[PDB]
């Protein structure tokens, strides 16, 4: 997985501001999630032909459509897997999986990102990327210390939230359920599912995601069956 057919073109804008726009097929697992009337409110990542991982605040239901990639796949939901360490008062272990009713048809412009290991770590100063529509842009962002992070988001940083950005460039392109990815053994892997960011969308504040690695196994076990 994670070895995209058309390759992410990441420049300097990346680094900067509001960042930049990609090369289509670029972030191939990026999905949109449209509401019953083609209104998009969240989008998310594909790991397979059949599942999306996105956030649970996205609060996504079985009449939301997976929009992937019309060279597009609108993929309807079959069941929605939200999970119980789902706390909204906190928005933590903010993960939700989706079964689409009819497979994702793998091609150049649509594929799946890889999943990480639970043991894997991830490096603060490590250069990951937000894709989004919050045309679809790509921005680049280092993850940080949940204790650095702590100091930028108070009390709302627990076990499984993992923070990333605040380096002159901005969190916010990052729509919810959206993808925050890194490297391994050269695949991109989903590290962070987008939770939330700076209002004013300061380019000087860090952005906060959910941490896969802490939830992979739940993906893992949840997956598997259903």
Short mmCIF file of N, CA, C and O in Angstrom, two decimals, residues 13-92:
data_model
loop_
_atom_site.label_atom_id
_atom_site.label_comp_id
_atom_site.label_asym_id
_atom_site.label_seq_id
_atom_site.Cartn_x
_atom_site.Cartn_y
_atom_site.Cartn_z
N UNK A 13 6.12 25.60 -1.04
CA UNK A 13 4.90 26.20 -0.58
C UNK A 13 4.57 25.30 0.63
O UNK A 13 4.13 25.72 1.64
N UNK A 14 4.66 24.02 0.59
CA UNK A 14 4.50 22.94 1.54
C UNK A 14 4.85 23.46 3.00
O UNK A 14 4.06 23.34 3.90
N UNK A 15 6.07 23.76 3.25
CA UNK A 15 6.49 24.26 4.07
C UNK A 15 5.79 25.42 4.60
O UNK A 15 5.52 25.52 5.83
N UNK A 16 5.29 26.21 3.79
CA UNK A 16 4.74 27.51 4.04
C UNK A 16 3.24 27.68 4.06
O UNK A 16 2.49 26.84 3.39
N UNK A 17 2.86 28.69 4.62
CA UNK A 17 1.51 29.27 4.79
C UNK A 17 0.37 28.34 4.90
O UNK A 17 0.19 27.58 5.84
N UNK A 18 -0.51 28.28 4.04
CA UNK A 18 -1.75 27.66 3.61
C UNK A 18 -1.30 26.52 2.68
O UNK A 18 -2.03 25.79 2.28
N UNK A 19 -0.02 26.51 2.61
CA UNK A 19 0.62 25.59 1.89
C UNK A 19 0.42 25.67 0.20
O UNK A 19 0.59 26.75 -0.45
N UNK A 20 0.19 24.42 -0.34
CA UNK A 20 -0.01 24.31 -1.65
C UNK A 20 -0.96 23.15 -2.01
O UNK A 20 -1.39 22.35 -1.36
N UNK A 21 -1.18 23.13 -3.35
CA UNK A 21 -1.90 22.18 -4.09
C UNK A 21 -1.13 21.10 -4.75
O UNK A 21 -0.21 21.23 -5.35
N UNK A 22 -1.73 19.90 -4.47
CA UNK A 22 -1.26 18.79 -5.30
C UNK A 22 -1.53 18.39 -6.81
O UNK A 22 -2.18 19.10 -7.48
N UNK A 23 -0.83 17.43 -7.08
CA UNK A 23 -0.73 16.63 -8.34
C UNK A 23 -1.64 15.52 -7.99
O UNK A 23 -1.44 14.52 -7.29
N UNK A 24 -2.79 15.63 -8.62
CA UNK A 24 -3.86 14.78 -8.66
C UNK A 24 -3.26 13.27 -8.62
O UNK A 24 -2.28 13.04 -9.09
N UNK A 25 -4.07 12.42 -7.95
CA UNK A 25 -3.66 11.05 -7.73
C UNK A 25 -2.68 10.97 -6.70
O UNK A 25 -2.38 9.98 -6.01
N UNK A 26 -2.32 12.23 -6.37
CA UNK A 26 -1.32 12.66 -5.42
C UNK A 26 -1.51 12.08 -4.04
O UNK A 26 -0.69 11.41 -3.59
N UNK A 27 -2.60 12.39 -3.60
CA UNK A 27 -2.98 11.74 -2.28
C UNK A 27 -4.17 10.93 -2.45
O UNK A 27 -5.24 11.12 -2.07
N UNK A 28 -3.91 10.02 -3.25
CA UNK A 28 -4.80 8.93 -3.74
C UNK A 28 -5.90 8.23 -2.79
O UNK A 28 -6.63 7.48 -3.31
N UNK A 29 -5.72 8.43 -1.52
CA UNK A 29 -6.61 7.67 -0.56
C UNK A 29 -7.49 8.71 0.00
O UNK A 29 -8.11 8.12 0.98
N UNK A 30 -7.29 9.93 -0.28
CA UNK A 30 -8.10 11.02 0.06
C UNK A 30 -9.40 10.78 -0.53
O UNK A 30 -9.65 10.55 -1.58
N UNK A 31 -10.33 10.93 0.28
CA UNK A 31 -11.72 10.86 0.14
C UNK A 31 -12.32 12.08 0.73
O UNK A 31 -11.74 12.70 1.52
N UNK A 32 -13.50 12.47 0.31
CA UNK A 32 -14.30 13.51 0.56
C UNK A 32 -15.53 12.95 1.34
O UNK A 32 -15.93 11.83 0.86
N UNK A 33 -16.16 13.66 2.03
CA UNK A 33 -17.40 12.83 2.40
C UNK A 33 -18.44 13.92 2.32
O UNK A 33 -18.50 14.83 3.01
N UNK A 34 -19.26 13.57 1.45
CA UNK A 34 -20.47 14.26 1.00
C UNK A 34 -21.71 13.67 1.70
O UNK A 34 -21.73 12.43 1.87
N UNK A 35 -22.43 14.66 1.75
CA UNK A 35 -23.61 14.46 2.61
C UNK A 35 -24.72 14.02 1.68
O UNK A 35 -24.38 13.78 0.60
N UNK A 36 -25.94 13.83 2.00
CA UNK A 36 -26.94 13.31 1.09
C UNK A 36 -27.06 14.14 -0.07
O UNK A 36 -27.16 13.49 -1.17
N UNK A 37 -26.82 15.43 0.04
CA UNK A 37 -26.87 16.37 -1.15
C UNK A 37 -25.53 16.98 -1.86
O UNK A 37 -25.51 18.01 -2.27
N UNK A 38 -24.52 16.23 -1.70
CA UNK A 38 -23.15 16.52 -2.39
C UNK A 38 -22.64 17.67 -1.60
O UNK A 38 -21.92 18.45 -2.14
N UNK A 39 -22.74 17.66 -0.44
CA UNK A 39 -22.11 18.64 0.40
C UNK A 39 -21.05 17.83 1.21
O UNK A 39 -21.14 16.68 1.66
N UNK A 40 -19.95 18.45 1.23
CA UNK A 40 -18.74 17.88 1.73
C UNK A 40 -18.43 18.63 2.99
O UNK A 40 -18.38 19.76 3.07
N UNK A 41 -18.12 17.79 4.04
CA UNK A 41 -17.97 18.20 5.33
C UNK A 41 -16.74 17.60 6.05
O UNK A 41 -16.30 17.94 7.05
N UNK A 42 -16.34 16.53 5.62
CA UNK A 42 -15.20 15.67 6.02
C UNK A 42 -14.60 14.93 4.93
O UNK A 42 -15.21 14.46 3.98
N UNK A 43 -13.28 14.64 4.99
CA UNK A 43 -13.05 13.75 3.98
C UNK A 43 -12.03 12.64 4.89
O UNK A 43 -12.58 12.31 5.98
N UNK A 44 -11.09 11.99 4.49
CA UNK A 44 -10.66 10.74 5.27
C UNK A 44 -9.63 9.93 4.40
O UNK A 44 -9.39 10.34 3.40
N UNK A 45 -9.23 8.82 5.03
CA UNK A 45 -8.31 8.00 4.17
C UNK A 45 -8.74 6.59 3.80
O UNK A 45 -9.48 6.00 4.57
N UNK A 46 -8.37 6.00 2.66
CA UNK A 46 -8.71 4.57 2.18
C UNK A 46 -7.39 3.80 2.43
O UNK A 46 -6.38 4.26 2.33
N UNK A 47 -7.59 2.64 2.90
CA UNK A 47 -6.45 1.67 3.24
C UNK A 47 -6.74 0.42 2.37
O UNK A 47 -5.89 -0.37 1.91
N UNK A 48 -7.96 0.36 1.91
CA UNK A 48 -8.38 -0.68 1.08
C UNK A 48 -9.61 -0.24 0.22
O UNK A 48 -9.96 0.89 0.22
N UNK A 49 -9.94 -1.14 -0.57
CA UNK A 49 -10.93 -1.02 -1.51
C UNK A 49 -12.29 -0.84 -1.01
O UNK A 49 -13.27 -0.39 -1.36
N UNK A 50 -12.29 -1.44 0.26
CA UNK A 50 -13.50 -1.42 1.14
C UNK A 50 -13.50 -0.57 2.48
O UNK A 50 -14.54 -0.55 3.02
N UNK A 51 -12.45 0.00 2.95
CA UNK A 51 -12.65 0.74 4.12
C UNK A 51 -12.06 2.29 4.23
O UNK A 51 -11.05 2.45 3.61
N UNK A 52 -12.68 3.07 5.10
CA UNK A 52 -12.26 4.50 5.26
C UNK A 52 -12.33 4.38 6.67
O UNK A 52 -13.16 3.81 7.54
N UNK A 53 -11.31 5.17 7.15
CA UNK A 53 -10.95 5.45 8.29
C UNK A 53 -11.35 6.89 8.26
O UNK A 53 -10.90 7.43 7.51
N UNK A 54 -11.96 7.70 9.22
CA UNK A 54 -12.06 9.09 9.21
C UNK A 54 -12.28 9.52 10.72
O UNK A 54 -12.19 8.60 11.39
N UNK A 55 -12.53 10.52 10.90
CA UNK A 55 -12.92 10.90 12.34
C UNK A 55 -14.35 10.73 12.60
O UNK A 55 -15.23 10.67 11.73
N UNK A 56 -14.58 10.68 13.99
CA UNK A 56 -15.86 10.32 14.52
C UNK A 56 -16.62 11.68 14.76
O UNK A 56 -17.76 11.76 14.37
N UNK A 57 -15.95 12.81 15.11
CA UNK A 57 -16.62 14.08 15.06
C UNK A 57 -17.21 14.34 13.74
O UNK A 57 -18.40 14.89 13.49
N UNK A 58 -16.65 13.84 12.75
CA UNK A 58 -17.22 13.97 11.37
C UNK A 58 -18.62 13.38 11.37
O UNK A 58 -19.46 13.57 10.30
N UNK A 59 -18.88 12.51 12.36
CA UNK A 59 -20.15 11.99 12.74
C UNK A 59 -21.28 11.47 11.65
O UNK A 59 -22.36 11.54 11.79
N UNK A 60 -20.47 11.22 10.86
CA UNK A 60 -20.66 10.39 9.63
C UNK A 60 -21.58 9.18 9.71
O UNK A 60 -21.61 8.50 10.51
N UNK A 61 -22.42 9.00 8.77
CA UNK A 61 -23.48 8.09 8.85
C UNK A 61 -23.59 7.33 7.48
O UNK A 61 -22.89 7.46 6.68
N UNK A 62 -24.64 6.46 7.64
CA UNK A 62 -24.61 5.46 6.46
C UNK A 62 -25.27 5.97 5.25
O UNK A 62 -25.46 5.21 4.19
N UNK A 63 -25.56 7.33 5.25
CA UNK A 63 -25.96 7.97 3.97
C UNK A 63 -25.07 9.16 3.58
O UNK A 63 -25.53 10.10 3.13
N UNK A 64 -23.85 9.02 3.80
CA UNK A 64 -22.81 9.82 3.44
C UNK A 64 -22.03 9.06 2.25
O UNK A 64 -22.24 7.85 2.32
N UNK A 65 -21.41 9.83 1.42
CA UNK A 65 -20.91 9.02 0.25
C UNK A 65 -19.35 9.18 0.24
O UNK A 65 -18.86 10.22 0.75
N UNK A 66 -18.75 8.16 -0.12
CA UNK A 66 -17.28 8.14 -0.27
C UNK A 66 -17.08 8.63 -1.61
O UNK A 66 -17.45 7.91 -2.47
N UNK A 67 -16.35 9.65 -1.83
CA UNK A 67 -16.14 10.22 -3.00
C UNK A 67 -14.57 10.00 -3.39
O UNK A 67 -13.90 10.59 -2.71
N UNK A 68 -14.43 9.16 -4.22
CA UNK A 68 -12.93 8.92 -4.38
C UNK A 68 -12.30 9.12 -5.84
O UNK A 68 -12.84 8.89 -6.77
N UNK A 69 -11.29 9.81 -5.63
CA UNK A 69 -10.56 10.29 -6.67
C UNK A 69 -10.80 11.83 -7.06
O UNK A 69 -11.12 12.56 -6.17
N UNK A 70 -16.73 11.97 -14.84
CA UNK A 70 -16.28 11.66 -13.58
C UNK A 70 -15.33 10.51 -13.59
O UNK A 70 -15.62 9.48 -13.91
N UNK A 71 -14.06 10.76 -13.20
CA UNK A 71 -13.11 9.69 -13.03
C UNK A 71 -13.22 9.24 -11.60
O UNK A 71 -12.38 8.52 -11.03
N UNK A 72 -14.30 9.66 -10.89
CA UNK A 72 -14.64 9.46 -9.55
C UNK A 72 -15.53 8.28 -9.15
O UNK A 72 -16.43 7.93 -9.93
N UNK A 73 -15.18 7.88 -8.08
CA UNK A 73 -16.05 6.83 -7.32
C UNK A 73 -16.74 7.47 -6.19
O UNK A 73 -16.25 8.11 -5.31
N UNK A 74 -18.10 7.31 -6.29
CA UNK A 74 -18.86 7.85 -5.11
C UNK A 74 -19.20 6.43 -4.44
O UNK A 74 -19.66 5.73 -5.20
N UNK A 75 -18.87 6.17 -3.30
CA UNK A 75 -18.94 4.83 -2.78
C UNK A 75 -19.93 5.05 -1.47
O UNK A 75 -19.69 5.91 -0.78
N UNK A 76 -20.90 4.25 -1.45
CA UNK A 76 -21.95 4.51 -0.57
C UNK A 76 -21.52 3.70 0.78
O UNK A 76 -21.00 2.69 0.74
N UNK A 77 -21.90 4.26 1.83
CA UNK A 77 -21.67 3.37 3.10
C UNK A 77 -22.58 2.37 3.43
O UNK A 77 -23.76 2.47 3.64
N UNK A 78 -21.90 1.23 3.85
CA UNK A 78 -22.59 0.11 4.31
C UNK A 78 -22.72 -0.05 5.94
O UNK A 78 -23.74 -0.35 6.20
N UNK A 79 -21.62 0.11 6.46
CA UNK A 79 -21.69 0.25 7.98
C UNK A 79 -20.60 1.12 8.33
O UNK A 79 -19.58 1.14 7.67
N UNK A 80 -20.77 1.68 9.58
CA UNK A 80 -19.97 2.67 10.11
C UNK A 80 -19.67 2.05 11.49
O UNK A 80 -20.53 1.61 12.11
N UNK A 81 -18.46 1.97 11.58
CA UNK A 81 -17.61 1.59 12.75
C UNK A 81 -17.02 2.74 13.53
O UNK A 81 -16.05 3.28 13.07
N UNK A 82 -17.59 3.05 14.56
CA UNK A 82 -17.17 4.19 15.34
C UNK A 82 -16.63 3.45 16.54
O UNK A 82 -17.03 2.45 16.96
N UNK A 83 -15.73 4.06 17.41
CA UNK A 83 -15.42 3.27 18.33
C UNK A 83 -15.44 3.96 19.84
O UNK A 83 -15.18 5.09 20.11
N UNK A 84 -15.82 3.17 20.80
CA UNK A 84 -16.10 3.40 22.09
C UNK A 84 -15.11 4.15 22.99
O UNK A 84 -15.56 4.53 23.91
N UNK A 85 -13.97 4.40 22.70
CA UNK A 85 -13.01 5.07 23.45
C UNK A 85 -13.18 6.57 22.66
O UNK A 85 -12.52 7.46 22.70
N UNK A 86 -14.38 6.52 22.01
CA UNK A 86 -14.82 7.67 21.27
C UNK A 86 -15.25 8.79 22.42
O UNK A 86 -16.50 8.78 22.70
N UNK A 87 -14.51 9.56 22.91
CA UNK A 87 -15.04 10.56 23.80
C UNK A 87 -15.02 11.95 23.15
O UNK A 87 -14.06 12.48 22.67
N UNK A 88 -16.28 12.46 23.12
CA UNK A 88 -16.54 13.81 22.50
C UNK A 88 -16.32 15.05 23.36
O UNK A 88 -15.92 16.05 22.94
N UNK A 89 -16.54 14.87 24.70
CA UNK A 89 -16.37 15.82 25.67
C UNK A 89 -14.86 16.09 25.37
O UNK A 89 -14.44 17.24 25.32
N UNK A 90 -14.17 15.13 25.09
CA UNK A 90 -12.85 15.18 24.57
C UNK A 90 -12.48 14.90 23.09
O UNK A 90 -11.41 15.36 22.64
N UNK A 91 -13.26 14.25 22.35
CA UNK A 91 -12.88 14.04 21.05
C UNK A 91 -11.70 13.22 20.89
O UNK A 91 -10.74 13.52 20.08
N UNK A 92 -11.46 12.13 21.62
CA UNK A 92 -10.24 11.32 21.76
C UNK A 92 -10.49 9.90 21.29
O UNK A 92 -11.48 9.34 21.46
#
